[PDB]
Each structure stands twice: as structure tokens, then as C-alpha cells.
Amino acid sequence: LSLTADQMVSALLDAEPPILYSEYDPTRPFSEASMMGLLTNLADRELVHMINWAKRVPGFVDLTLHDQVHLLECAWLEILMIGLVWRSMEHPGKLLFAPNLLLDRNQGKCVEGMVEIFDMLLATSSRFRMMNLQGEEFVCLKSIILLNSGVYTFSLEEKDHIHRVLDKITDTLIHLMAKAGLTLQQQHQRLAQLLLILSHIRHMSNKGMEHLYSMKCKNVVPLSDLLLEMLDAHR
Amino acid sequence: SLALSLTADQMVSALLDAEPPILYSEPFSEASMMGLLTNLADRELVHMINWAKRVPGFVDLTLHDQVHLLECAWLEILMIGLVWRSMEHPGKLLFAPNLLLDRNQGKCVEGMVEIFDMLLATSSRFRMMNLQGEEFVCLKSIILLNSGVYTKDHIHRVLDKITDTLIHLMAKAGLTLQQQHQRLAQLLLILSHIRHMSNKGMEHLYSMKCKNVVPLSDLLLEMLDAHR
Amino acid sequence: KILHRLLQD
Amino acid sequence: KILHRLLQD
Ligand SMILES: O/N=C\c1cc(-c2ccc(O)cc2)ccc1O
Ligand SMILES: O/N=C\c1cc(-c2ccc(O)cc2)ccc1O
């Protein structure tokens, strides 16, 4: 890649997917079927925008079509959750699923096994608030998840290309921290802090992926045709 | 605390001196393979718990927090250690010096072959990156402190201390500033995949429990109850 | 393969 | 809680 650090950020920020709305009605109270219908409907529409966001991620179109499917199948719920955590940053104690859908930790109890996932998503958003995560770093992390969560489950030149694109986003992250006025020791620490949250996002995705399979078998609310294909990829 | 006042060279020596031993096994049928791995993991957990106390800054925490961190990281720590032993054995996993299995030997257990491929790819990644033992003990102590911390300010101060020691190792090795934080990112991104293997491995154990392929020890059972 | 189709635009 | 017993020797 030839995109400089300032051009790397601009491309990622320009590719930011929209913030979709939900058909939630504040007059209608919540239930497990009502809530799971809204979240899966929202996640299904955000998928089609992520698929087009992935194409704009620098270096992603250079990969083969089969590799592009693998990276998305494994990291899609990771990208959805980190985007959710990023939107709920300035809304403590709540998860901003949609501009008209603020959910509490107590509201998340209307679905079985959902309260434990709300806490981790809440704690992750509280973590971004402590670090005061910037949008320039958020678009870098979200593109890292896309190119990292599935590169191990793999051709050597394609993996070589991914490792070169990942090193570019790393230098881009360090460049942002340098211009932000952080010492050479603080840039390494913040970089490490930003990469360790990616371990928790993988965990939230796994339990979130594991939770989606329970609803499918319980058949509480039917799942989308696209959302079900992603679910069979993991289990 | 004591961990905070440590030196990057003194932090590395404290981690190398606390390294748990490489235990031995007691690989044909299904129940005989799951029995050897759960027996091996149960004895390894005892050393890991004592290894945890010797990790600088871990004993400063409360007992409940020590329980939490170990309960959500024990399989990650077991796996990154297994991945480290299997580094000089490409295509094979060195569970024990007498228990060395390859890819097809994992097929003797229902669903184990999928975890084998992720474990082998991780050891191939360590081999490709030429991971150092001083870096390995740092990555292992990061997992112990980071995997359960979002469920506090002292842990993040100790984690930053381990980051400086990681940079200290690469700096004294001759890597430029760009090579230092580029390799730093490559190590920490593996922790995302090690967390993935732990989760899929955690459900495999829970699957083996419900299928009752082999009896599990009470200690290993408690560590499995902290998940799901 | 919906993902493969949507990626093939 | 066996883990509690092993953490304090
Ligand atoms: O699994 N069932 C529902 C579920 C949905 C989400 C989710 C996360 C982010 C997002 O933009 C849209 C939806 C997160 C966790 C979940 O458990
Ligand atoms: O899940 N059930 C068994 C299982 C056990 C191990 C394991 C890994 C490392 C180790 O030192 C000892 C044991 C790894 C993967 C597994 O799937």
C-alpha cells in the first residue's frame, strides 16, 4: 500500500457505514420476542453496509473473493459489537443500538442470557470512555478486526499482503498518537491498551455468536437468510 | 507496589524464574485421548495457580479478583503454553514430552481436529515471528491480567509495565522504533486468536462433559463452571 | 453464499 | 471452591 498515515485515516473515516434506525415503537413495551426481533433486524441491515464497508477497507479488495468471505464470516459480529460500543461511548450505562433504541442493563434482562453480554458491552464502552477513544483510532481498530480475526484460519503471499496491510494500520495508529502529543512510552502503552480490548471483543463475539445459536434452536424470533449463513460459519 | 518498582530486566527475570514446569503424560481411542488431556490439564492448573502468585503484581490483588482472572484465562494460559512447547515441533502439538500429537491424531475426538488446526497455526505464527522466551512469559502474564479485567486501575498499571518490558526486549535486540511497535502489535493480535481458541475449546470440554466421554476432576470442573 | 454474492458487485 | 484453597497454599 502507498496510502500515507493521513490518507489511511481519511479513507477509513470516509468509508464509515451509516447509523441505521430501528422500527422500535416507544409505545410498545419490551419482550424477549420484541427485543430479539429488533436486534436481529438491525444486525441484518448493518451487515449489508459492512459488506460494502469492507470493500473500502484499504487492501481488502486485493484479496480473493473466497478470502473476503472468510474474514467477514468470522469477524462480522466483532465489527457490529465494536461499532455498537463506539456509539454508546457518550451514553454511560446504556447501549446505543440505534438513535431511537437506548437499552439499559435491566432492559437487557428481558432476553435470557442477554444481561451478561450487556455488561461486557457496557464495560467495553466504559473502557473507551476512560481512554477517550478517538474516531481516528476507532476506524483503525475496526479495520484491524476485519483483517486479523480470520487470517490464522487459512496463499502465503495473500497472508503476506495482510501482514503488510496490518503493519500499515499499526504505523497509522502510532502516527495519530504522536501528533496527539503522547510520549514514545505513552504511544506504546495506548497501542497495547487498544489491542487488548480486541481480545475482549473476540470474547463478546464468541458468547454473542453462541447466544445467537440458542435463539435459532429456541426459535424465539426467525433469523434473516443472511444472518443465518453467518451463524452456520461458526457452528 | 512491588511490581511497579521493578525493572524491565528485573521483570523478565521474575517471570522466567516463575515459569511452571513441563509436566509428563500418563492417544488411540476417543476417551483415552480426552482422558490424557484432562488429566494433564488438571495437574498443570496446580502449577499455574502457584505461577500466578509469582507473577509480579498478581498477589497484590484481592483473593476474589485472583479467582476471577484465573477462571477466565486458565485455558488461554494452558494453550499459549502448549503453543510455545510445540514451536520446535512443526505440524505436531507437544502436550507433554511423551504426548506429541499431530493433526490427524486429533481426529480421534469429536470436534478436536478443529482446535488442533488453530493451535498448529498459532505455533506456526510463533515460529514465523521467532517468538522469544522472554516475550512468551510477557504474553502469558498479559493474558492472566487482561482476560478478566473488564468484568482495576492497578491491573492496567501492571499491564503497562509489562508493555514497557516487551519494548525493552525488542529494543535491546536491535529493532528500530517502527519494528518495535509493529512486532508489539503482531504479538497482541495473537491474543485475540488465543481467546478464540479458548472459547471454542471451553465449549468442547463442556461438550465432552455432557457426553461424559471421560470423568473430569473437581478442580477442572470448577474452572469450567465459570464459563456458561 | 449470500456474502459471496453481495461481495461480487 | 478448590481454587480458593490453592491460591493461599
Ligand atoms: O445475539 N442476539 C442479539 C445480539 C445482537 C447484538 C448486536 C450488536 C451490535 C449491533 O450493531 C447489532 C446487534 C449484540 C449482541 C447480541 O446478543
Ligand atoms: O477441550 N478439551 C480438551 C482440550 C484440552 C487442551 C489442552 C491444551 C493445553 C494443555 O496444556 C492441556 C490441554 C486443549 C484443547 C482441548 O480441546
User: Which CATH number does the domain housing residue B155 bear?
Assistant: 1.10.565.10
Q: How far is CA A138 from the centre of its chain?
A: 10
| Gap between the Cα atoms of B145 and A57, Å rounded | 32
- Quick check: B203 and A210 in contact, CB under 8 A? yes
The cell numbers describing A217, all together, are: 434452536
Find the domain containing A211 and state its range: 1-235
Angle between helices A135-148 and A65-87 (to 10 degrees): 140
Give C1's contacts in chain A (Cβ within 8 Å): 69, 229
Of A48, A66, A73, the CB nearest to C6: A48
**Distant-in-sequence, close-in-space partners of B150: CB < 8 Å, separation ≥ 6:** A120, A123, A124, A127, A197, A200
Tally the residues of chain D.
9
- Grid cell 459489537 in the structure block, residue: A81
DSSP string, B12-38: HHHHHHTPPP-------SHHHHHHHHH
Provide the H-helix boundaries in chain A.
5-14, 32-56, 65-87, 115-131, 135-148, 156-179, 184-218, 225-234
Reported in sequence order, the residue ranges of chain B that DSSP labels E, i.e. its strands, are: 92-96, 99-102
- Quick check: A75 and A150 in contact, CB under 8 A? yes
The cell numbers describing B5, all together, are: 518498582
Ligand 2 pocket, residue B205 CB under 6 Å: yes
The cell numbers describing B191, all together, are: 491474543
Q: How far is the CA of A44 from the centre of ligand 1 (A)?
A: 10
CB contact under 8 A, B160 and A191: no
Nearest of B12, B49, B35, B29 to residue B136 by alpha carbon: B12
Choose, out of A152, A176, A202, the residue to mutate when testing the contact with B (most B CBs < 10 Å).
A152
The cell numbers describing B3, all together, are: 511490581
Nearest of B92, B182, C7 to residue A191 by alpha carbon: B182
The Cβ of residue B19 has, within 10 Å, a number of other Cβ atoms equal to 15
Angle between helices B30-54 and B218-225 (to 10 degrees): 80
Residue nearest to ligand 2 atom 12, measured at CA: B41
- Quick check: A34 and A28 in contact, CB under 8 A? yes
Experimental technique used to determine this entry: X-ray
Residues of D with a Cβ under 8 Å from any B Cβ are 1-4, 6-8
The Cβ of residue B42 has, within 10 Å, a number of other Cβ atoms equal to 16
| Number of structural domains chain B divides into | 1
The cell numbers describing A124, all together, are: 467495553
- Determine if residue A91 is labeled as part of a ligand binding site: no
The Cβ of residue A206 has, within 10 Å, a number of other Cβ atoms equal to 20
| Gap between the Cα atoms of B138 and B159, Å rounded | 10
- The SS3 call for residue A97 is strand
